[PDB]
Structures are given as C-alpha cells and as structure tokens.
Amino acid sequence: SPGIWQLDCTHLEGKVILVAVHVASGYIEAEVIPAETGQETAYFLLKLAGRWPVKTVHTDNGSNFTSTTVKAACWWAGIKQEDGIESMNKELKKIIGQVRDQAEHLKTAVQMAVFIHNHKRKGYSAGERIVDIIATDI
C-alpha cells in the first residue's frame, strides 16, 4: 500500500541511524542521532510526513510505540501509529563503508548511502518506484 512506512534503527560509530522504509518500494529516508529517544523519533516522523503522504508507520520497537511524544507527533501529522529489514541495515552499512573515506562526518556518509540506495536500479530504482506507486494512488 502506498502510505505504509516502517521505522528501523541501527548503530554505527557510537551513534544511531534512524531509517524510515517505504515498504512497497524499498525507498528510504535516514538520519543520524546521538541515541534513539521519543523526541528524536517524533521529530523524524514529522519531517517524513511533510515530505511524503504517510498513512501508517510500523514503529521499530515497543518504546517508540508507547512514547507519548511519538504518539503526539503521529496525531499531529495524521499518521496511524502501528506496532510490528536486517538485509536493509546490512546493505546500508555496506554502502556507508564504501563511501566512509569520502566524508569526515558520519551524517554525510549516511546521506550519500541514502542517495546510492534510492538511485540504484534493480530496471527501476526505489526512488522511481515510490513516485510511480503514489501517482497511481492519486
């Protein structure tokens, strides 16, 4: 379904990479934060929902599902917060490793990996698939 997203967390270099995957296409958005908190997750969802038509988010764990702050952001943004990827984290870490030496900051390497992941043709790319899926829904 065009509006379904899945949250995902992974660790790297003492930091956390928070990822949102558009389930039907494999398209991703990602950010680097010091640690996963309800405030960081709520702010990340608010950003994602202003950029794509987010109908449902499958939270990554029970703490984010429980968080009053995350629930408040889902309420504000009109998101249906729902309850309950390893290959995606491994592939994303693999791309980060291939670009790591071109970037001083981890956040720069992570955005380079988001770019490569979304543009990779598998032939359509994930960026093309998300747009085609949502335009068909309009």
Ligand X SMILES: Cc1nc(C)c([C@H](OC(C)(C)C)C(=O)O)c(N2CCC(C)(C)CC2)c1-c1ccc(OCCc2ccc(F)cc2)cc1
Contact set with its own copies (CB under 8 A): 29, 43, 46-47, 49-53, 76-77, 102, 107-108, 111-112, 114-115, 118-119, 124, 127-128, 131-132, 134-136, 138
Kindly state whether residue 43 participates in binding ligand X, applying the rule CB under 6 A: yes
Give the tokens for residue 28: 């991703």
Kindly state whether residue 33 participates in binding ligand X, applying the rule CB under 6 A: no
Kindly state whether residue 42 participates in binding ligand X, applying the rule CB under 6 A: yes
Of 26 and 58, CB closest to ligand X: 58
Of 62 and 72, CB closest to its own copies: 72
Kindly state whether residue 125 participates in binding ligand X, applying the rule CB under 6 A: no
Amino acid at residue number 6: Q
In order, the DSSP letters of the chain are: -TTEEEEEEEEETTEEEEEEEETTTTEEEEEEESS--HHHHHHHHHHHHHHS---EEE-SSHHHHH-HHHHHHHHHHT-EEE---HHHHHHHHHHHHHHGGG-SSHHHHHHHHHHHHHH-B---BHHHHHHHHHHHH-
Angle at 38 between CA 65 and CA 4, to 5 degrees: 50
Give the total of residues touching ligand X (CB under 6 A): 15
Number of residues that this document lists for the chain? 138
Kindly state whether residue 105 participates in binding ligand X, applying the rule CB under 6 A: yes
Of 46 and 88, CB closest to its own copies: 46
Span of 56-64, 65-73, 90-98, 126-134 interacting with ligand X by CB under 6 A: 65-73
Q: Which does 50 bind (CB under 5 to 8 A by kind): its own copies, ligand X, none?
A: its own copies
